[PDB]
Design a protein around this ligand. Structure first.
Ligand SMILES: CCCCCCCCCCCCCCCCCC(=O)OC[C@H](COP(=O)(O)OCCN)OC(=O)CCCCCCCCCCCCCCCCC
Ligand SMILES: CCCCCCCCCCCCCCCCCC(=O)OC[C@H](COP(=O)(O)OCCN)OC(=O)CCCCCCCCCCCCCCCCC
Ligand code: SF4
Lengths: 200, 149, 176, 320, 106, 100
């Protein structure tokens, strides 16, 4: 598994590296156990902050069926169009969160601007805010967010973040995971026949 | 008070003009930075007159009621500038334009058929109720009388 | 007992000094609560179990709460007075301090000349105090109710607001 | 074992039992937090570990390794002290709870007065949190919650004065030994109801939670808190519920006095019933208006507690 | 007796461990984990009045606490005295409620 | 055993400190805070004396003292509120119109 080191957004240190733990110089069975324990607690305790924008927030509340403060949130779900007047607000809320933090882009608009390539819309939240999981759709089905959360859990269980801010390497090593598209290419292509669009 | 209602007050140019480009311009971090600062300095640089409001008996507190994720009810996220005398509202100005996606400008960049997807996104909770007025109007332009079914 | 008396007695004097010389009002109240908890330990060390509890239940759990309420209500702190820090200016505290020092010296002299068989520390219970309150000191308890009633009536008369609303604007002469 | 003395081991076993009680209480409060969340979901017809039991452990790890943050313009001392008071207030009050014959951290003469001392200091957590946060809206919410607490802390002690009257003592063991025949739930029924209402209010539990609901200019005294400091308030509340529950058992349900099961088992059994009774209450109870809770505490509970004590005194002196 | 000495030490340890546990969790949160490198208005006196009323009633309850632990020893005379005290307290409470000083909503 | 004299000196130190506070501070709040130190110190002395004589009278006097402190602080802070509401200033030096 290769990792991307974000040592100390559009432009920042992104050096592809090897598992820092596997490196013998910094290889300790105890340290590895500690890393796994922290990753386990974080992936099984992702408190969310749903920034409600446009129509995607409505699908999100259906899935909900709260860390009202960005301070208590570990994940910011950008669900809606990134309007010009809203972009400063989104950046401020994300900048009022503490490490570790994650961002899931839900919807074509948050992903790339979607059908709204217009003068009053930022073409993607990834133009100003780092994103971890992208959910295609418009609006993405409530169940799609659940899949995205599970994908984030997997990515979080493989991260190598500093165990303490006073000792060790303060670098966030994120694993270069395999694309879901290539992972499930086989089953998708094998599909042959489908139900005719004639019945309910 | 004739001030911009849909675009930032610092916006240059009138979007719905024909000579105005419709597609989005290159993202500029600098503008976001400045926009973010202006937002942080809004309370310090607040003038009531700019919002059409006037200071009266004085000591009246001008306030900004943010109605976004703090109070989210699928109504969207906007703010109302509230002029209060204790808890009584002396005057309020709803600040809107935070959800403007240039849907009317898109009508001039999409065919009569390729615009249908956009109609449903004017009032998301209405779905087909939003495409009824559009299809019926285009049918008047086409001279089409739809069958009873 | 001896350790408790001297350690709590010292915690109290040090905290009290921090209170009178502090600039932040809430910090001053915090050190005042610390001194009240220390005096409660002194009470317990001397066998005054009832007084001990009351020192934390009424003085540091009611009278002080009221003080914090007022500081938080009027957003006190950072006022020109607390910015000028005049009390710290030597020409402002030297005179008062000398008067207080001379008063302490004269008082201590009188105390040092008193009979002192020592305080044993035998615990005096709240039951014993209650028998005294509703026995020899009955008129005190009945008249104490009238005293607290007077405090309630006066505090309401001068403390009540004429302007309705949880949040009010500071206007000259509280004009409505 | 050379230094070991028959007396030393007594002064060592006692310290060990006290530490055991402290640990078990903190564990119980934390577990209840999870046990509740799940039960509430079952009521709403809706995992990390064994039935989600490890979710509690997961949260603790996340909160410990979460960036600790004190607002740049916040009084660090007051901001840091608030969570501490919330966690170490009713926890200390458990020192008076006799869990079983031979198991009590402190058999104090002041007895119940110690709980009142700690309950009185708990209010500062809410006040300090609001003032230190530096959020104008947090201050208003803290003040609303603090005023609500004082409206219930006023009759908290008076609600237990009938029990003290019958026992003739503030000592908890004496109070338990005085329920040998009849538990005080029957004679001091109004006391039990009023104490329960005040106890949940002191712990800021449903329906005395969210006192900032009506005011749009109020947010909450936990808005600026994050990580462990935020968790200390949450855990403190559940530790307080455990302490209150264990006080109700000791004051109105005979404590560890039961017909057949071991004494400690009774204590636990009853305490668990109260801990889950609050859970049933949380689900089956509509939150009343801030105005209603303020009025109910001063116009109904306070008068009733004052009347119960007078009537209890008359019956006691009459029977004598 | 060693029992009272043992209970004294146990109480002290419980208090020290309890406050120590809170500090440990707090200092752990501060150390464990990484970190990003990085007047005109007032509150109504209705908040003060509630606190002031609490103070007055709480100090009044002190006397009733002392009576509670000694009702039998004080006898019926003590009951009559306490009854007058409780009546004055209730009379003042009635006054506060009737003057509307105890209604949060205007 | 604690020497009665040691207890009385503790109270005297807290009394003189409270008085110094009441004279050096111009803020009405710090003046009211200073008075609380003075009355608490006087109540402490009564408890020390009652403990030396083994009498409940010391604690009975303490209860009367804390009752006055509660009532006096209540009225005191009410006047502070009125002064703030009308003059938005807690400098007691400004409350000096009547003189001579
Ligand atoms: C920092 C905190 C410093 C706290 C210093 C004071 C406490 C010191 C440690 C406990 C001392 C206990 C002791 O000496 O023994 C218990 C003592 C007497 O108990 P008794 O049963 O009458 O006699 C037993 C035999 N001598 O008991 C007593 O006479 C004293 C009882 C009260 C002890 C202190 C109570 C808590 C005080 C907290 C102050 C916090 C200030 C901030
Ligand atoms: C600080 C850490 C140490 C605190 C003191 C620990 C030791 C306490 C102790 O020894 O208690 C002394 C006394 C004994 O009372 P009791 O057990 O009823 O026996 C009566 C006959 N001697 O009991 C007392 O008088 C103490 C009762 C009050 C204890 C207060 C503890 C601190 C409360 C505030 C915390 C903030
Ligand atoms: S992606 Fe589609 S559904 Fe989601 S907010 Fe944008 S337009 Fe609405």
């Amino acid at each position: 598994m290769d990792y991307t080191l974000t040592r100390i957004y559009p432009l920042q240190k992104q050096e592809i590296v090897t598992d820092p733990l596997e490196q013998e110089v910094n290889k300790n069975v105890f340290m590895g156990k500690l890393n796994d324990m922290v990753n386990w607690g974080r992936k099984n305790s992702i408190w969310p902050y749903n920034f409600g924008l446009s129509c995607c927030y409505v699908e999100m509340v259906t899935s909900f069926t709260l860390r009202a403060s960005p301070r208590q949130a570990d994940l910011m779900v950008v669900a809606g169009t990134c309007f010009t007047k809203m972009a400063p607000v989104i950046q401020r809320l994300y900048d009022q969160m503490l490490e570790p933090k994650w961002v899931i882009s839900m919807g074509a608009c948050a992903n790339s601007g979607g059908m709204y390539d217009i003068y009053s819309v930022v073409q993607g939240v990834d133009k100003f805010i780092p994103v971890d999981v992208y959910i295609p759709g418009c609006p993405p089905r409530p169940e799609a967010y659940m899949q995205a959360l599970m994908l984030l859990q997997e990515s979080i269980g493989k991260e190598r973040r500093p165990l303490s801010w006073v000792v060790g390497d303060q670098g966030v090593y994120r694993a270069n995971m395999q694309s879901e598209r290539e992972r499930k290419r086989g089953e998708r292509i094998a599909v042959t026949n489908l139900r005719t669009p004639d019945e309910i | 008070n004739l001030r911009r209602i849909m675009m930032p007050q610092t916006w240059k140019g009138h979007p719905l003009r024909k000579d105005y480009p419709a597609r989005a311009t290159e993202f500029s971090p600098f503008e976001l930075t400045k926009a973010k600062q202006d937002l942080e300095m809004e309370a310090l640089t607040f003038k009531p007159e700019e919002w059409g409001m006037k200071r009266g008996t004085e000591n009246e507190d001008f306030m900004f009621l943010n109605l976004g994720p703090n109070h989210p009810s699928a109504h969207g996220a906007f703010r109302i500038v509230l002029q209060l005398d204790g808890e009584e509202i002396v005057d309020c100005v709803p600040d809107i334009g935070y959800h403007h996606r240039g849907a009317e400008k898109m009508g001039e960049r999409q065919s009569w058929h390729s615009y249908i997807p956009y109609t449903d996104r004017i009032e998301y909770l209405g779905g087909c109720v939003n495409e009824m007025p559009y299809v019926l109007a285009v049918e008047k332009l086409a001279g089409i009388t739809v069958p009873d079914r | 007992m001896e350790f408790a008396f001297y350690i709590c007695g010292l915690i109290a004097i040090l905290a009290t000094l921090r209170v009178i010389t502090h600039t932040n009002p809430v910090h001053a109240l915090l050190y005042l609560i610390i001194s009240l908890l220390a005096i409660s330990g002194v009470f317990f060390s001397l066998g005054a179990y009832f007084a001990g509890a009351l020192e934390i239940i009424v003085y540091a759990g009611a009278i002080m709460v009221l003080f914090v309420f007022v500081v938080m209500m009027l957003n006190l702190g950072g006022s020109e007075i607390e910015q000028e820090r005049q009390w710290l200016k030597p020409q402002v505290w030297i005179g008062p301090a000398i008067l207080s020092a001379i008063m302490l010296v004269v008082i201590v002299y009188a105390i040092l000349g008193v009979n002192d068989q020592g305080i044993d520390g035998t615990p005096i219970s709240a039951k014993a105090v209650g028998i005294t309150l509703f026995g020899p000191y009955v008129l005190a308890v009945e008249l104490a109710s009238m005293l607290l009633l007077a405090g309630l009536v006066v505090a309401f008369h001068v403390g009540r607001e004429e302007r309705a609303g949880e949040v009010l604007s500071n206007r000259k002469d509280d004009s409505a | 074992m050379s230094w070991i003395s028959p007396e030393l081991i007594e002064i060592l076993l006692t310290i060990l039992k006290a530490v055991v009680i402290l640990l078990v209480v903190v564990t119980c409060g934390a577990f209840m937090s999870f046990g509740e969340r799940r039960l509430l979901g079952l009521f709403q017809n809706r995992r990390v570990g064994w039935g989600g039991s490890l979710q509690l452990v997961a949260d603790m790890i996340k909160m410990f390794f979460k960036e600790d943050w004190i607002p740049k313009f916040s009084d660090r001392v007051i901001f840091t002290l608030a969570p501490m008071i919330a966690f170490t207030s009713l926890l200390l009050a458990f020192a008076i709870v006799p869990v079983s014959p031979g198991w009590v951290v402190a058999d104090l003469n002041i007895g119940i007065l110690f709980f009142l001392m700690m309950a009185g200091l708990a209010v500062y957590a809410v006040l300090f949190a609001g003032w230190s946060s530096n959020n104008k809206y947090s201050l208003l919410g803290a003040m609303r919650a603090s005023a609500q607490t004082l409206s219930y802390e006023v009759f908290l002690g008076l609600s237990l004065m009938g029990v003290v009257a019958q026992a003739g003592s503030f000592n908890m063991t004496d109070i338990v030994n005085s329920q040998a025949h009849v538990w005080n739930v029957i004679p001091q029924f109004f006391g039990f109801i009023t104490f329960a209402i005040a106890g949940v209010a002191v712990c800021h539990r449903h329906p005395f939670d969210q006192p900032e609901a009506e005011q749009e200019l109020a947010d909450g005294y936990h808005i600026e808190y994050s990580g462990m400091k935020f968790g200390l308030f949450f855990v403190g509340e559940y530790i307080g519920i455990v302490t209150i529950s264990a006080l109700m058992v000791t004051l109105f349900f005979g404590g560890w006095q039961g017909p057949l099961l071991p004494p400690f088992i009774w204590f636990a059994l009853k305490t668990a019933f109260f801990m889950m009774m609050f859970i049933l209450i949380r689900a089956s109870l509509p939150r009343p208006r801030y105005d209603q809770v303020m009025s109910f505490g001063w116009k109904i509970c306070l008068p009733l507690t004052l009347i119960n004590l007078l009537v209890t005194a008359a019956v006691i002196l009459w029977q004598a | 007796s060693t029992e009272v000495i043992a209970h004294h030490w146990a109480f002290a340890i419980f208090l020290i461990v309890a406050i120590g546990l809170c500090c440990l969790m707090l200092v752990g949160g501060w150390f464990l984990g990484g970190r990003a490198r990085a007047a005109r208005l007032r509150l109504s006196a209705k908040f003060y009045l509630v606190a002031m009323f609490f103070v007055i009633f709480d100090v009044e309850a002190l006397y009733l606490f002392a009576w509670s632990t000694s009702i039998r020893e004080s006898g019926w005379v003590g009951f009559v005295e306490a009854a007058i005290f409780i009546f004055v307290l209730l009379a003042g409470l009635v006054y506060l409620v009737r003057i509307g000083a105890l209604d949060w909503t205007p | 055993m604690i020497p009665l004299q040691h207890g009385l000196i503790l109270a005297a130190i807290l009394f003189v400190l409270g008085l110094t506070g009441l004279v050096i501070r111009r803020n009405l709040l710090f003046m009211l805070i200073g008075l609380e130190i003075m009355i608490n110190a006087s109540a402490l002395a009564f408890v020390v004396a009652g403990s030396y004589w083994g009498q409940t009278d010391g604690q009975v006097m303490y209860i009367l003292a804390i009752s006055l402190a509660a009532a006096e602080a209540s009225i005191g802070l009410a006047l502070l509120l009125q002064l703030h509401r009308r003059r938005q200033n807690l400098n007691i030096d400004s409350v000096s119109e009547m003189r001579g």
